[PDB]
């Protein structure tokens, strides 16, 4: 069972809900910009939160915009925005547009430009070349990335975008790591020790570490049979060690040879 | 609450009124071009001024003129000019044509797409209307009767050098909107008019963030309900928050206005900028 | 009655006339580049001079070139040049091409490039892609702008462009301001005092000041009736103050809240 | 001679073997994306690994996917996936689909031409295959039987941000290849394994050029035959050298392996870099 | 007045004469490419040289080759080559084909338009003519008789790297024209030959503006008539100046040559540069 | 009879031959980059070497690539490469692709990019948009230029390109200059003196000097007849001086007025 950090869940839930309330005399930022080191569960925890709140999400990947092969990223964002706006009026539920891994320089400008224009009038979002007298719904936008260009400063400053820095703290790690290894028969104190052993590491390192433990088996199994005859043999059965000792050496081999 | 900057109201009231008078000895510009930065309450101050003088507004949005689906923008501007003309005659009141965001996807708002406002055709159209505000006809039409002069308000971030001939001839007047300290104290004071702040604290707040737009200050007042909102979410529970806010069955949540200080606003402000 | 500054009228008249004389052993600059602070009557005084000399002018606006919406500025200049060249042969009169407010960086280069090429051979000016064995007439070109790019240095240097700096002096102001207020029943000494009161200001400030005096009336008239009922009232009759006292306070309100 | 870096061999052997096992409790990524710089023996270490495990490889080259003449690249990748599937079934051995140079003409290898790998369609295809590796059909075909899961190896210099969803879902695993000091000592040692060099001299050679790719080191060993070659040209004579080397009548020239020292390699290296 | 720089005249006279001689032991280049900066009297020194040797010139302008309306430029160059050939035969005198401004809208003279000189087709054509100057036929024509070799002079600011093969084969010779101090003293001296200046003052004038083109110096002499001109305008009156200068009824105004000094020229020069 | 410098002939011959040998365990650079001051016989000596070894050469000029008028330089290189690859399989002889005068910035990148890609796989060189399962032959590429962009550093470094600096030394000059004047009845000691008199000069200066001697005649002949009547006269017969004294003054006039 995966673990969503309470203050992460709050920030995101408050942002979305605040966009669907129409408290007069209170302008609301349309965009939530979640930034921080890569692989700290920005995307994963958003998805946890949405599943929990029963929110349907329209998802664009950052690579879908940074690439020359995708043509027009302004169009794509505006298409998905208007699409999510209709799903609100239809399903009568909270819906969200999400852009992932927003961290090229040329498409980056167009993307910033597009989000600025949408945030300026979340209700009058037209496809380029098109015009529709119809107001459409305001759709809260969640964005993730390593940091946000100084080109986003004007948005944050005028309260059209809310920045949120995500750096898991140790209670947050114990919870998330605890969930990563929740099916591996571990006690909290083993979980607390694991986190304290690798304390500058990203959440990603820890889920990588879990997969590595399975890889180490398969490696040894291959060394035993020999490479010469591994193919015939297969064309690795047991529950691996997972003891806290083994997770640590496995982690140290990862950190001694990483990236 | 909302504060109308006297000089914004004067400029716009004088421009419109002057267009309904036939004072000799001076040329009256038909067009008032209001330019300046975003988040300073331009279109909004216009709205407060119109709502106040009881002025009825025909609108053209910049995303309208940016579109083929508005057809010929020359034809559209003329249409709405004529449509707007019939109402001074019919309703017997001051009416205004207003064109908003006359430079939609330009500069830092450029999305790098095939479509942009044909601004030269727009300029050309306004020039033609302005030379003879009393005979504005659709292209290809010739035998219609004279009509009433309609003052035109255009907003944008800046106006192209193309508008220079209009200005040079006194057919258009640029009005730059950058709120000054006195303006900000007024507007910001109105934003925090129910929060039990002294005049001096409002002056302090403005002086603490001398480079910020008006929108920075109202954005600032907005983030403090967040706690009530979060708590409201916890009470209803995450499993059922969606149903609660969007299905309009039971009543909207009733939020109290919170208490805060100058100190807290300044702190919040620095966090936003840091 | 508007006032043209004698040395402005001379410079321009000498340039044009010099281009229509064919004094052998004397090469003549084709381009007159008039530069200076904005709103000092560069354009207005050119127009005064042309009206006076009975010169027909072909006018291009700088914004007509700086804009992406106008396509090809080289073409446009060359079209208008050849057009003015024909009007000489037809009307048998002095004709002039004028480019206004030349102060983007990309079109600016093409414009400079176009004027260089034309100035190099004022008689062989072909539309791009076209060729015509026919010589056409030499057409003097007047250009205005705040300053001229270092890209114009080669032209000025080889005597294909004459630079002329325009900064009205006080005799020039008294004359021009005197004409701006010529119908407002003012004595020279009131005109001389007005100019001396606002002495770093552009001519533009002064014609703005005159219009402001009318605006102040209409303002007060609106304050009296009230905004609530101004619309019905109209759907401001008298000759405004214009006393030298009133022009001064009006000017000081303009300079205390300008741009 | 050739040295297989243990950890390269382990990563690739584990990835492939893991794809032929049905171990529960963990998701097995179908795709192994091997990225890193050029001239570090990537595709080559893969070849040594495949030749070793007796693994048969179906290939797609990046210049294949860059071409209309490969038709639809989605259709091609699927074809070769299915073609590669039939062989695990038929030959009863481990088989791999491998896509090489997945970013052919991008970055410093850009030739500025109309054609580039439609990498989004490629990504989309791999995503679809990966969700269901057991039912991979050509577009427009529906009623074929299940097939065998095929591990996929892709090489490139870097992988687009588009592959992030594949990785995030554990359908793909990135493996960065930058040879470390221990790797280089191994590989370089194998390059100079017949040249009578001590372990220490090999360590010295590596440490003298710590920033160089593997290809720099073998390039270095190659230029020393040049003298034998020149002399061979002088003997045959320039008039007849062409006939001699290309017409395969008489036998290929037989060159001796020369003697050289660490000192000479280092000198040669500095000349190449200077 | 006009001064012909001896070495310009020698280079061009030798190039042309050499092309009408059949001296063995050396290859004669058909083409003389004269390059260098604008405003240095290139085309003009050519004109003085041709007028002097009694050489008749067939011309192609760069704006001709830039145009579809010249049709195929390969066909045109060949036409004029043949046209120019018939005259050495008919008139019995030296004749030259001259191509001017061979790089019309390139570099700082680029107008950013669809049309530019197809310079590769031009180069290709000159290459072909040069290999066989005696059989130059229009494309698609085959059975014409031999003709006379025509020396070709081309001017431009620089010559593309494409002309390298022509030069390498001695079919073309580049001649760079940058006036040196001795040249300038000559040319400038000729510009001011009627102004009662000593040799030393001319040397001083040249040395005061060592970086300026020849055109800077004649531009300088030109602006001093301005006063006579202004006064002439005042006499006739602004109302009637247009009629006077352009209608060729009464006679052209007769201007006197004014008196001026080195001091005044230098001052004027600094004002122009400042 | 023209003279090829022995070490120039060696370097080039060794490079080409080395590309046609398939000595296992020896990777061979495909590209030979010959760089140095302009006009030192880089191109000319390549051509001498090819004529000597009976090598047919496919030649591209650098200007054929640097120009906007030639469209696609990647294509052009790849076309010529595949063409030379076929001539090997057909003629059964050594063939070479040569690129001359490679010393705009935009095409320069594409050219570098193209040579990198070809050098990476000399056997799988496809036209853009095309694919052919067929291996084609490895074609050694010779390139000349004044220097090679830092963009070529990766190639040289990974042994896909061999750099070769060409600066003629005095034995090299005596040989080459000796051949330039081989038909002018000169002794070596006159040749040695000529080279020592103009010792910082390029080989180009010397072949220019030879042509100048003929030009000086024709000049004097023109001065005698007079320019006024040179045309009629012609519409310069003798073997010119060529004495070592005359070559020297002719050289000094060239160096006193050059470029
Ligand atoms: N709350 C979580 N529970 C379990 N695993 C997680 C959690 N957050 C992150 N992970 C693991 O770490 C990886 C990286 O998370 P991701 O959302 O991609 O980080 P970011 O969005 O900050 O780059 C995921 O692929 C997942 O396996
Ligand atoms: N000679 C003049 N007489 C009367 N008004 C003038 C005169 N010159 C300028 N003005 C006023 O000042 C304004 C600015 O002049 P303009 O020619 O636009 O200046 P510039 O060309 O230097 O920018 C004009 O719109 C006009 O109202
Ligand atoms: N080996 C040689 N023999 C005779 N002449 C030569 C020789 N090398 C160069 N030249 C002369 O010098 C000129 C310049 O040589 P080139 O090959 O163009 O130099 P680079 O290729 O270095 O620019 C040639 O046009 C030729 O006349
Ligand atoms: Cl601030
Ligand atoms: Cl190194
Ligand atoms: Cl100078
Ligand atoms: Gd990540
Ligand atoms: Gd109508
Ligand atoms: Gd105060
Ligand atoms: Gd401000
Ligand atoms: Gd102005
Ligand atoms: Gd199949
Ligand atoms: Gd060691
Ligand atoms: Gd390295
Ligand atoms: Gd003919
Ligand atoms: Gd002297
Ligand atoms: Gd000079
Ligand atoms: Gd050369």
From Swiss-Prot, chains A, C, F:
Q: Which GO terms describe its molecular function?
A: ATP binding; ATP hydrolysis activity
Give me the residues that bind ATP, please.
36-43
- Keyword tags: ATP-binding, Nucleotide-binding
What is this protein's function?
Activation of RuBisCO (ribulose-1,5-bisohosphate carboxylase/oxygenase; EC 4.1.1.39) involves the ATP-dependent carboxylation of the epsilon-amino group of lysine leading to a carbamate structure.
Q: Which family does it belong to?
A: Belongs to the RuBisCO activase family.
Its protein name is Ribulose bisphosphate carboxylase/oxygenase activase
Q: Gene name on record?
A: rca
């Amino acid at each position: 069972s995966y673990y969503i950090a309470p203050r992460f869940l709050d920030k995101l839930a408050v942002h979305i809900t605040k966009n669907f309330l129409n408290i007069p005399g209170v302008r609301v930022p349309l965009i939530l910009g979640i930034h921080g080191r890569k692989g700290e569960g920005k995307t994963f925890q958003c998805e946890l939160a949405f599943e929990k709140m029963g929110i349907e999400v329209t998802l664009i990947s950052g690579g879908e915009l940074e690439s020359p092969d995708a043509g027009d990223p302004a169009r794509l964002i505006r298409l998905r925005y208007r699409e999510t706006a209709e799903l609100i009026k239809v399903r009568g539920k909270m819906c969200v547009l999400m852009i992932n891994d927003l961290d090229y320089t040329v498409n980056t400008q167009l993307v910033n430009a597009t989000l600025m224009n949408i945030a300026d009038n979340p209700t009058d979002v037209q496809l380029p070349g098109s015009y529709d007298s119809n107001p459409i719904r305001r759709v809260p936008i969640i964005v993730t990335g390593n940091d946000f260009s100084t080109l986003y400063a004007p948005l944050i400053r005028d309260g059209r975008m809310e920045k949120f820095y995500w750096e898991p703290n140790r209670d947050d790690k114990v919870g998330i790591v605890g969930g990563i290894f929740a099916e591996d028969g571990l006690s909290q104190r083993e979980i607390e020790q694991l986190v304290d052993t690798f304390p500058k590491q990203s959440i990603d390192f820890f889920s990588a570490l879990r997969s590595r433990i399975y890889d180490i088996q398969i490696r040894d199994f291959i060394h035993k049979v020999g490479f010469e005859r591994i193919s015939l043999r297969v064309v690795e059965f047991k529950k691996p060690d997972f003891s806290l000792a083994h997770l640590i050496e496995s982690g140290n081999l990862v950190l001694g040879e990483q990236q």
